[PDB]
Assembly symmetry: D2
Homo-oligomer: 106 residues x 4
């Protein structure tokens, strides 16, 4: 349930994808990431603890997760259809979403 | 967190939108729908009760939720912006995603 | 390349998908709909001839086309994977984007 | 019309968004990038002239453009709402799509 725990689960499963052998491994990891992302959006990060839940900073923080869930969905199509290289390449593009949110609120 | 309960909160909040006057009411209903959707995809429907979580059928079952969440995300842009009518029209288009899943797994 | 011709293209190719025998016929028809959608969005519909290109109605008019292109994209995943029936059902959900615009602007 | 011209349009307008002062400049530049993306996806790049138009590389080539159009769509929400800064940040998240495609196919 914890924001820090959700970030650890996102971190571990991202590496899993990068170095996966089969599609079953990639799909398992992406589904775990989707769970963590769904649980993370409702949390308030330390940096934004003083700002209202309707601030333009709390929008955007939530928005980051909608984008990530969209990317996971897209990777899932590729993994399920046995394109393991394409799935791994797509997963590499998640980092961009990771980095942009971290550069503002981490 | 029950599948039936999450469906109720989805069904209720969609009617709230239809009858809303201001944008703040729309934002509040869409956030609740997003939480329910994020909570419902992990559950197993009575029609697939004998199927494994990593089975092919469970994969397409979760697919409808990925599409739903992206439509809530899109509607949220309009509601946060203050475009009440357009947000209501966006919310209406959800009904098709609701319908398609129900045809297959209900 | 005018609005009416592009609407004929979308209409015809949607029938092609519904009556398709194979995935290759589905791929071909989705490609043609993507080209039609890409060519249609810059046009001005007769009912908004009095409005500026930069106006809330014209932003909304073009929006319907980003949604359609996104749905075509999703359906192409399914047809490239060889999932013909799933791709035919996904193409059916396009109809709601068709009707949403038509109710406002046709 | 040809792929090189399309790529210059994308490049020029991306710089314009970075250096933009008003929402009107961002709107116009994002719209021009949407048209360029739409005219680019049907071409065949030099490095894939020897491959089949139904090959996984050609599928992946076209796919990069659907992702870009979705990101331009996303940024236009922010720009049409007058929100210049976050429309500009959204526009930066788009380089990751530019780079993934050049890293494999340019
Ligand atoms: C890709 C999807 C992501 C990976 C991999 C990681 N994140 Fe994040 N993240 C975000 C915040 C606000 C924090 C700080 C939370 C706090 O300080 O309490 C983090 C933190 C991490 C961490 C460090 C965890 C630790 O205790 O050391 C890791 C390893 C991590 N994140 C990996 C915010 C966001 C965010 C905003 C919307 C996104 C999209 C991501 N994080 C994505 C990723
Ligand atoms: C699959 C991807 C689904 C999507 C998307 C939506 N729903 Fe659903 N819903 C789904 C199932 C499998 C069921 C049946 C579960 C059961 O055993 O009863 C339902 C059920 C409902 C119900 C009936 C609830 C009840 O207790 O009888 C309603 C009112 C309902 N769903 C509404 C609904 C709405 C409004 C949605 C979109 C906004 C929607 N659902 C999406 C599966 C899926
Ligand atoms: C707005 C975003 C639209 C979307 C999405 C779709 N259509 Fe459309 N269509 C639209 C307009 C404004 C019009 C009127 C054009 C005019 O100059 O009068 C239309 C018209 C049609 C027609 C009739 C064309 C004619 O014979 O005059 C058809 C058959 C049609 N549209 C089909 C169609 C389909 C199948 C779509 C979904 C894939 C669709 N349209 C989307 C605006 C919009
Ligand atoms: C693949 C799906 C691509 C995406 C997404 C983007 N680009 Fe691209 N670009 C791509 C190819 C295959 C090529 C080479 C074409 C050739 O004839 O060699 C390019 C090339 C460019 C160039 C070079 C222009 C020139 O004179 O040769 C530029 C400046 C360029 N691309 C910019 C660019 C930008 C800014 C993008 C993101 C918005 C982008 N490209 C995406 C393939 C793909
Ligand atoms: Zn995709
Ligand atoms: Zn939108
Ligand atoms: Zn999908
Ligand atoms: Zn968005």
């Amino acid at each position: 349930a914890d924001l820090e725990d959700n970030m650890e689960t996102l971190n571990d499963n991202l590496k899993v994808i990068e170095k996966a052998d089969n599609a079953a491994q990639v799909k398992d990891a992406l589904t775990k990431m989707a769970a963590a992302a769904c649980d993370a959006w409702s949390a308030t990060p330390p940096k934004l603890e003083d700002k209202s839940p309707d601030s333009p900073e709390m929008h955007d923080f939530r928005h980051g997760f909608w984008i990530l869930i969209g990317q996971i969905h897209d990777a899932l199509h590729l993994a399920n259809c046995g394109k393991v290289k394409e799935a791994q390449a797509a997963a590499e593009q998640l980092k961009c979403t990771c980095n942009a949110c971290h550069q503002k609120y981490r």
